[PDB]
Amino acid sequence: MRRYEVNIVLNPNLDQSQLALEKEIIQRALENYGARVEKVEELGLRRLAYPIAKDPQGYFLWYQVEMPEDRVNDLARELRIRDNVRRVMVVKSQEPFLANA
Amino acid sequence: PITKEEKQKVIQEFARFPGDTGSTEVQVALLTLRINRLSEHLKVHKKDHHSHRGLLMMVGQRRRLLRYLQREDPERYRALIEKLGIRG
Amino acid sequence: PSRKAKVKATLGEFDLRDYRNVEVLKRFLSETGKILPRRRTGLSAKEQRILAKTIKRARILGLLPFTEKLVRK
Amino acid sequence: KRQVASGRAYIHASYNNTIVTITDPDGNPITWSSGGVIGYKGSRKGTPYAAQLAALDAAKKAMAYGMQSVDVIVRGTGAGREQAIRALQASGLQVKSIVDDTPVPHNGCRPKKKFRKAS
RNA sequence: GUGGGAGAGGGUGGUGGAAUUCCCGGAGUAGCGGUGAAAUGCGCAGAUACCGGGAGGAACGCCGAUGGCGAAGGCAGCCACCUGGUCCACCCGUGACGCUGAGGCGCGAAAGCGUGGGGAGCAAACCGGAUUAGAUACCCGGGUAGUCCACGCCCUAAACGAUGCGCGCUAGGUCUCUGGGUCUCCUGGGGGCCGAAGCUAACGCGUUAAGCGCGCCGCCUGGGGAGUACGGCCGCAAGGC
Ligand SMILES: [K+]
Ligand SMILES: [K+]
Ligand SMILES: [K+]
Ligand SMILES: [K+]
Ligand SMILES: [K+]
Ligand SMILES: [K+]
Ligand SMILES: [K+]
Ligand SMILES: [K+]
Ligand SMILES: [K+]
Ligand SMILES: [K+]
Ligand SMILES: [K+]
Ligand SMILES: [K+]
Ligand SMILES: [Mg+2]
Ligand SMILES: [Mg+2]
Ligand SMILES: [Mg+2]
Ligand SMILES: [Mg+2]
Ligand SMILES: [Mg+2]
Ligand SMILES: [Mg+2]
Ligand SMILES: [Mg+2]
Ligand SMILES: [Mg+2]
Ligand SMILES: [Mg+2]
Ligand SMILES: [Mg+2]
Ligand SMILES: [Mg+2]
Ligand SMILES: [Mg+2]
Ligand SMILES: [Mg+2]
Ligand SMILES: [Mg+2]
Ligand SMILES: [Mg+2]
Ligand SMILES: [Mg+2]
Ligand SMILES: [Mg+2]
Ligand SMILES: [Mg+2]
Ligand SMILES: [Mg+2]
Ligand SMILES: [Mg+2]
Ligand SMILES: [Mg+2]
Ligand SMILES: [Mg+2]
Ligand SMILES: [Mg+2]
Ligand SMILES: [Mg+2]
Ligand SMILES: [Mg+2]
Ligand SMILES: [Mg+2]
Ligand SMILES: [Mg+2]
Ligand SMILES: [Mg+2]
Ligand SMILES: [Mg+2]
Ligand SMILES: [Mg+2]
Ligand SMILES: [Mg+2]
Ligand SMILES: [Mg+2]
Ligand SMILES: [Mg+2]
Ligand SMILES: [Mg+2]
Ligand SMILES: [Mg+2]
Ligand SMILES: [Mg+2]
């Protein structure tokens, strides 16, 4: 067990319904592997710095889950299967390194 | 890797007495743990030569200690080998 | 000579490890989406190092740019 | 004939020639010129003068389509790169803004033996 | 042992953006390219310049350092997993268990070799254009092996600090990376510069010694012939010792 951060950027053109199905599959997978959502920050959509998948925006998802290391790579590989899932960035959580504080 | 508990387990399982952390036996045990864990790693990544340098060093560090033990208490020696299941 | 104000001084407390605060990270990139030098970021080697890491993360997410077009001239 | 009145002016400078391509607001070329498009044939094409003419030539060819103002995009570091700018400014066409956008890799292909060394 | 730390140390998988090339579409027209000057070359079967889409390979801009890591070779996008070394604090445990290391074994840049794959860019050879007294060259247009991946070989080098490893001892100053502390500064590990004593043929070295000492290994003994011949060992070969 280790604490990670599953970042996910989704298709900025999903209707309240579409957003939901994809967003659940995310929930579905997280379980099948051994994740445990401690918190989420559906920041929603923002203007990308460069066009990703031909769009100037992306719908952002965040999670401070905890799971079994030997699966992190496998799970991430899974989330990516979806076509509305255009980004999967998983990161080992870290102690905030302040500065100029 | 090797977690505190795992580590702590073997230590206890080998301390010559409560509190014994750095005895020849404890060391050889601990070393054997690493050597083995590492040995398995190499069976997989046969190309990780650098790590293999380390393996080589431990195997040697172990020989050194065991050699010492066997010259000081040939008994605890046979005992430790038996437990750890070393030698040939 | 790398004059003017340093990016660190011109700012408050922040988490150099937070690869999502575009508002603050965005400050360490030049006019072009390039990562600013210590001379300019006013950071310590150790800090500067951590920055580069998070910035690179922000870029891959799309939050920050990899490069921008030079304006004026 | 097509009337555009506003578009882009791409200046492709290099140490061997200057070459201006004027396009619509979508990048589609309307007209273009270069050191060779004018008299110059040898090394006189990389001359800043060549640039000037070549640039001016394009500006006129553009005026014809009603072109009145344009955004400049500069690529390359040849001589007369700054001359093509200067030229366009004094070309009737209103220069809305300059912008250098020379491509640079983040290190992809081994350069020709002629372009090798760093630090 | 316990608690902390920095790192391009290694291996595996995945992944991101820039650029080159090719292909598709648009728009567009007479050149582009290249040089000291040119020409070969490419372009009206429409190139160059410009915009949009796609495929593919290789390398990672800024950060970036005078920086860091590694025993050496060497190591640089980002993420995860597997894994080596190492520094510091606490003085907790063993109780000289240490140092060196012929032979052996392993690692070992590039080029090269085998089998299979890949192949964008670059490019021995080679095909051409120039230059020249000539030009089996430098400059220019092309281009095969190769450069990349897997597995197995090869074992070399200005494999360099041209400085074997370990330990103790002998002023300081200054910049720096990384850690601890009562945090001007003190203390430890690493990276530089200048310098006490001393050393050195000199240049220079100078707590990162080339100083003062002890331990162990390797090596030298004028130049050419020659890293050749012979023999042995190794390698598929090239060839290595
Ligand atoms: K021609
Ligand atoms: K360095
Ligand atoms: K480690
Ligand atoms: K071949
Ligand atoms: K290689
Ligand atoms: K080999
Ligand atoms: K400190
Ligand atoms: K002297
Ligand atoms: K000198
Ligand atoms: K022989
Ligand atoms: K043979
Ligand atoms: K050989
Ligand atoms: Mg020319
Ligand atoms: Mg520790
Ligand atoms: Mg590394
Ligand atoms: Mg591309
Ligand atoms: Mg076309
Ligand atoms: Mg022709
Ligand atoms: Mg025709
Ligand atoms: Mg054709
Ligand atoms: Mg082209
Ligand atoms: Mg294109
Ligand atoms: Mg291809
Ligand atoms: Mg070193
Ligand atoms: Mg480790
Ligand atoms: Mg004690
Ligand atoms: Mg005692
Ligand atoms: Mg030894
Ligand atoms: Mg080799
Ligand atoms: Mg090679
Ligand atoms: Mg081969
Ligand atoms: Mg082949
Ligand atoms: Mg070529
Ligand atoms: Mg001739
Ligand atoms: Mg050539
Ligand atoms: Mg050297
Ligand atoms: Mg010093
Ligand atoms: Mg020091
Ligand atoms: Mg220091
Ligand atoms: Mg250094
Ligand atoms: Mg003196
Ligand atoms: Mg000195
Ligand atoms: Mg000494
Ligand atoms: Mg010899
Ligand atoms: Mg002789
Ligand atoms: Mg003689
Ligand atoms: Mg000789
Ligand atoms: Mg030889």
Swiss-Prot record, chain A:
Stored HAMAP family: Ribosomal_bS6
GO term, biological process aspect, one: translation
A GO term, aspect molecular function: structural constituent of ribosome
Recorded superkingdom: Bacteria
Main function: Located on the outer edge of the platform on the body of the 30S subunit.
Pfam annotation, one family: Ribosomal_S6
Signal peptide: none
NCBIfam families linked: S6
Assigned protein family: Belongs to the bacterial ribosomal protein bS6 family.
Gene behind the chain: rpsF
Lineage start: Bacteria, Thermotogati, Deinococcota, Deinococci, Thermales
Protein source organism: Thermus thermophilus (strain ATCC 27634 / DSM 579 / HB8)
PROSITE patterns reported for this sequence: RIBOSOMAL_S6
Protein name (Swiss-Prot/TrEMBL): Small ribosomal subunit protein bS6
CDD domains tied to this protein: bS6
InterPro entries (UniProt xref): Ribosomal_bS6 (IPR000529), Ribosomal_bS6_CS (IPR020815), Ribosomal_bS6_sf (IPR035980), Ribosomal_S6_plastid/chlpt (IPR020814), Transl_elong_EF1B/ribsomal_bS6 (IPR014717)
Swiss-Prot record, chain B:
Gene Ontology CC, one term: cytosolic small ribosomal subunit
Domain of life, per lineage: Bacteria
GO biological process, one term: translation
One protein family per Pfam: Ribosomal_S15
A molecular function (GO) term: rRNA binding
Keyword ATP-binding: no
Keywords carried by this UniProt record: Ribonucleoprotein, Ribosomal protein, RNA-binding, rRNA-binding
This protein's record includes keyword Transmembrane: no
UniProt family annotation: Belongs to the universal ribosomal protein uS15 family.
Described function: One of the primary rRNA binding proteins, it binds directly to 16S rRNA where it helps nucleate assembly of the platform of the 30S subunit by binding and bridging several RNA helices of the 16S rRNA.
Record text on subunit structure and interactions: Part of the 30S ribosomal subunit. Forms a bridge to the 50S subunit in the 70S ribosome, contacting the 23S rRNA.
The protein's name: Small ribosomal subunit protein uS15
Biological source species: Thermus thermophilus (strain ATCC 27634 / DSM 579 / HB8)
Swiss-Prot record, chain C:
Keywords: Ribonucleoprotein, Ribosomal protein, RNA-binding, rRNA-binding
Domain of life assignment: Bacteria
Listed GO MF terms: small ribosomal subunit rRNA binding; structural constituent of ribosome
GO cellular component: ribonucleoprotein complex; ribosome
Swiss-Prot/TrEMBL GO biological process terms: translation
Keyword RNA-binding attached: yes
Physiological role: Located on the back of the platform of the 30S subunit where it stabilizes the close packing of several RNA helices of the 16S rRNA. Forms part of the Shine-Dalgarno cleft in the 70S ribosome, where it probably interacts with the Shine-Dalgarno helix.
Family from the record: Belongs to the bacterial ribosomal protein bS18 family.
Subunit structure, interactors included: Part of the 30S ribosomal subunit. Forms a tight heterodimer with protein bS6, also interacts with protein uS11. Binds to the C-terminus of IF3 and to the central section of Era.
UniProt protein name: Small ribosomal subunit protein bS18
Shown residues within the full chain: 16 to 88 of 88
From Swiss-Prot, chain D:
Entries under SUPFAM superfamilies matching the protein: Translational machinery components
Signal sequence range: none
InterPro entries the UniProt entry points to: Ribosomal_uS11 (IPR001971), Ribosomal_uS11_bac-type (IPR019981), Ribosomal_uS11_CS (IPR018102), Ribosomal_uS11_sf (IPR036967)
Region called Disordered, residue ranges: 99-119
One of the record's GO molecular function terms: structural constituent of ribosome
Coiled-coil positions: none
Keywords: Ribonucleoprotein, Ribosomal protein, RNA-binding, rRNA-binding
GO cellular component, one term: ribosome
Biased composition (Basic residues): 109-119
GO BP annotations listed: translation
A Pfam family reported for this protein in Swiss-Prot or TrEMBL: Ribosomal_S11
Transmembrane parts of this sequence: none
PROSITE patterns given in the database record: RIBOSOMAL_S11 (PS00054)
Assembly and binders: Part of the 30S ribosomal subunit. Interacts with proteins S7 and S18. Binds to the C-terminus of IF-3; however exactly how IF-3 interacts with the 30S subunit is unclear. May contact the C-terminus of Era.
Family: Belongs to the universal ribosomal protein uS11 family.
Entries under NCBIfam families matching the protein: PRK05309.1 (NF003698), uS11_bact (TIGR03632)
Role: Located on the upper part of the platform of the 30S subunit, where it bridges several disparate RNA helices of the 16S rRNA. Forms part of the Shine-Dalgarno cleft in the 70S ribosome, where it interacts both with the Shine-Dalgarno helix and mRNA.
Record's protein name: Small ribosomal subunit protein uS11
Organism listed in the record: Thermus thermophilus (strain ATCC 27634 / DSM 579 / HB8)
Gene field: rpsK
